[PDB]
Amino acid sequence: KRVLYVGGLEEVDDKVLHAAFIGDITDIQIPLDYETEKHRGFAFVEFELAEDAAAAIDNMNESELFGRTISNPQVYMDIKIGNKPAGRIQMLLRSDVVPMTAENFRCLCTHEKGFGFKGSSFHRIIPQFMCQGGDFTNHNGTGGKSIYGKKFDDENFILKHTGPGLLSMANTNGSQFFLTCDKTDWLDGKHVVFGEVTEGLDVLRQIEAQGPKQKVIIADCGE
Amino acid sequence: LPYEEEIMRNQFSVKCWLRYIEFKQGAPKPRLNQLYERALKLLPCSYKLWYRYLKARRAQVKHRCVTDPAYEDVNNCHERAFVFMHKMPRLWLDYCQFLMDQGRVTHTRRTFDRALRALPITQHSRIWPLYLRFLRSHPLPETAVRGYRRFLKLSPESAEEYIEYLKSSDRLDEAAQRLATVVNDERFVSKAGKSNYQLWHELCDLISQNPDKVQSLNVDAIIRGGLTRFTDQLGKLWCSLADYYIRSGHFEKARDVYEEAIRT
Amino acid sequence: VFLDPNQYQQDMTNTIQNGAEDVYETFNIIMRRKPKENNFKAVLETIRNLMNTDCVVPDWLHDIILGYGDPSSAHYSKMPNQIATLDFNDTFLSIEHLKASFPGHNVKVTVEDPALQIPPFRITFPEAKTLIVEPHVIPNRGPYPYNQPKRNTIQFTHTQIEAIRAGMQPGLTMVVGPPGTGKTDVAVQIISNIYHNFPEQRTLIVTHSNQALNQLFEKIMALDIDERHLLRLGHGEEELETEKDFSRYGRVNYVLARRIELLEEVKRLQKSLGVPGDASYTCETAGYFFLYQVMSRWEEYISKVKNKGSTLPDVTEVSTFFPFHEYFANAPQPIFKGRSYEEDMEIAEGCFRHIKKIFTQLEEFRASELLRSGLDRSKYLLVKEAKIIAMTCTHAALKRHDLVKLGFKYDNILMEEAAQILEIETFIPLLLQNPQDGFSRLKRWIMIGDHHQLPPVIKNMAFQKYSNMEQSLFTRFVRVGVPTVDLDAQGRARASLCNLYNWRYKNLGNLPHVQLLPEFSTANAGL
Amino acid sequence: RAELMKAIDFEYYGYLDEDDGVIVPLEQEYEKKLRAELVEKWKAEREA
Secondary structure, three states: OEEEEEEEOOOOOOOHHHHHHHEEEEEOOOOOEEEEEEEEOOOOOOOOOOOOEEEOOEEEEOOOOOOOOOOOOEEEEEEEEEOOOEEEEEOOOOOOOOOHHHHHHHHHHOOHHHHHOOOOEEEEEEEOOOOEEEEOOOOOOOOOOOOOOOOOOOOOOOOOOOOOEEEOOOOOOOOOOEEEOOOOOOOOOEEEEEEEOOOHHHHHHHHHHHOOOOOOOEEEOOO | OOHHHHHHHHOOOOOHHHHHHHHHOOOOHHHHHHHHHHHHHHHOOHHHHHHHHHHHHHOOOOOOOOHHHHHHHHHHHHHHOOOOOOOHHHHHHHHHHHHHHOOOHHHHHHHHHHHHHHHOOHHHOOOOHHHHHHHHHOOOOOHHHHHHEEEEEEOOOOOHHHHHHHHHHHOOOHHHHHHHHHOOOOOOOOOOOOOOHHHHHHHHHHHHHHOOOOOOOOOHHHHHHHHOOOOOOOOHHHHHHHHHHHHHOOOOHHHHHHHHHHHO | OOOOOHHHHHHHHHHOOOOOOOOOHHHOOOOOOOOOOOHHHHHHHHHHHHHHHHOOOOHHHHHOOOOOOOOOOOOHHOOOOOEEEEEOOOOOOHHHHHOOOOOEEEEEEEEOOOOOOOOOEEEEEOOOOEEEEEOOOOOOOOOOOOOOOOOOOOOOOOOHHHHHHHHHHEEEEEEEOOOOOHHHHHHHHHHHHHHHHOOOEEEEEEEEOHHHHHHHHHHHOOOOOOOOEEEOOOOOOOOOOOOOOHHHHHHHHHHHHHHHHHHHHHHHHHHHOOOOOOOOOOOHHHHHHHHHHHHHHHHHHHHHOOOOOOOOOOHHHHHHOOOOOOOHHHHHHHHOOOOHHHHHHHHHHHHHHHHHHHHHHHHHHHHHHHHOHHHHHHHHHHHHHOOOOEEEEHHHHHHHHHHHOOOOOOOOEEEEEEOOOOOOHHHHHHHOOOEEOOOOOOOEEEEEEEOOOOOOOOHHHHHOOOOOOOOHHHHHHEEEEEEEEEEOOEEOOHHHHHHHHOOOOOOEOOOOHHHHHHHHHHHOOOO | HHHHHHHOOOOOOOOOOOOOOOOOHHHHHHHHHHHHHHHHHHHHEEEE
């Protein structure tokens, strides 16, 4: 119970969040108005009963040592349909089934390879079949490049697109990744399913309802 | 110990200093305070080392009686901590607890006011009930009227403790104006489930038993306003109005208050 | 419009019972009047509020206002908490003037050297006529050349100095100044002595006519009183004063500009000392910057110099170990002349006292920083910050509701020209505050006036002739039998002019040091 | 609510309690008796 649930502080930064908590070891602020600060020690982790409602850039930030403000990597991409946000798809990319495609989706969300889903759009979206995007080269599913080159093989097809928010590596799998909102067992054996959005399944359903008639692009994304 | 002293000189973080003091945790108290002063001179604004310094200092200084140069050094390093940790309420609470340990009154009031200055608006709730305890620990009410006035200016839903303080420290007139100005407001929580009747009965009994102190308010207008406020429990307020006339010495007026107490 | 509520209630209880015509349903002419005479309703509201609040008048002024009992109990010689120690900066110009201006009193000077017998003086007041006087020195105000303004140069008479001696003590006192004696200098010396002895005390100064209030307010700039404690609310602010201002916003913005300048000086001292940090400091951070970087550096400075040591420290040791040499580069170099060790330590203590003056001024400005709104800042200026408050009677009766709305408190009350001030116009600024928790903050009540002078501007002859409503409170307090301080020597008019109207006053003499001037030695040309 | 609880705050920071001059000597007068009682209070527990 060393992590906090500090909210009420997008204008804040990690240094401004950790300056009040300094010996904080972890400080990961969410894309919404929430952050979690964790101290390594035991006496320094009791900041909720010690510096609650602390002033963070002329704003009070109440700190509670809980997990109310919120392994397989989670590609958390605020997928925006058009100029408005269609929801934050926190697609838990299944590293237990397809770890290479899950790491490719997580790196495309985090934009650590120079290109990826942070800013790309899904130009191959079908109604309750597939929504394929992540290609940052041609922006149509006909470009894209994986970590091994332009084209990479699928890792494993142990998972299946059996429900909403299930993510697969679209194609042979380069930078193309497909989110599924329904059953896609007919395409099994060709696209390796590498995700299941426990959070952002409503965002995947909104992306499937919008898909393309609208520019469904995740401008903000990360791990 | 020489390699540990060289490592503590070469390192800068709080964990090496805490490990060195835990290694040298005997009774080195003057050299320990010198090493504390050197470590905090190298590293300022570190909350863990400052809290450990004030905790070890307040634990070790206890042989001194009431007024010592060691206690003046404790006070001087308390504002030396408050240079950077003024926004931290725990060191303010530690200094105020040590000030009730020492017995200072006006300097404790000055440091409570400086804590109210330092904490902007948010952390006053961690320092205000200790100030209420400070004003309840002293039977003179001249500071405490203005202190509880400031507490009612900050949080207005605390007038019942002020009424209890003024009925325990015999400021009965100001208790009558405070009771009369809290019971006629619309939104007030007494935190006891009085349902606005026990407050009226307490105000009426307090202004009935002691009319010589209450020389500013209109007693009859307040109690008749309460009698027009209620419709079901009028008899106690009628007895309180005529008992106000009994302690005022007006037996015929008490008989008349009983007369329209019968009639209305 | 706010109609008359009592007359409205009388009209509603008249028009529904007796069947009369409704007054407020047939009006056809609206009438407006000029300002400064449309404030009689504020006067009556002040009177009604003073009637409604039961115990505004204190018990030591109750029998004096009502005139019952002994009329000399308002004098300062019958009171047990009489103030002994009094500080006089510029009242006495010389030690022989202090000796010659105290009749019936022996002066015991604590020193025997006449070189140190200089103003300022500190006099301890009661074999029974012994006055324990020590001539003390002013603290050093820093290395700045212009840190001392012009002081008083008027040599007052013994009666005029006894008037200040009665004015410093709490109670009722009066200065009966005939036209010629120059009571304005005595008034501003009373104001300066009150401000210098008790800077935490608040002085209300009330003058009816705005020209005489401006004439009394103009002389304060030529004294040793800082302008940040001055306040003058009202419509008669229009004087010849150069910096203008002097209002609720007009001194709060001066407080903010002074805070900005002193925080710039704190930033300059921070860059002189090499403390890390480039952002602007607040008043709290400035006070903690003082208590961490200036107080500790002064502590190690006096430890290395070792003032409380076995031997005398060196003169050049102060100059080498002073840590604020590069801060005072705007001062004329050198800061320390090196003549003597205690003189260099006096210069260093003057630098530290100017630094502490800046830091305690920022500690006073901390509360102005703590309030968000300018209305709260003007309230802070009106109640705590400004120590000198200059009113007229009409504006005081206008704003007496607003003063008790904003919680205005004072310590001493002065009315100038108490025969030009009416009796209700005397009583209204007496009671601008109310006693809280059984405590009265009123100590001094000083009437500077002349009961043989004019009644005020009354536009009806019959009221001022029959009803005697033109009789001032000064003239009434004379005619009951309170002992008065009648000024004797006159210091602006010719002696042959004074001999024409000296019979009206009790021994109106002539001051010789004004009459020996070349303007009074000669006569009128051509006559 | 910081903005609602900062609606009005006057005489809150201890700047008007010392202007009247009535509680400043009295707090020290009670402080002298309190510390004089605490001297013998700690002296009663020193040898015990």
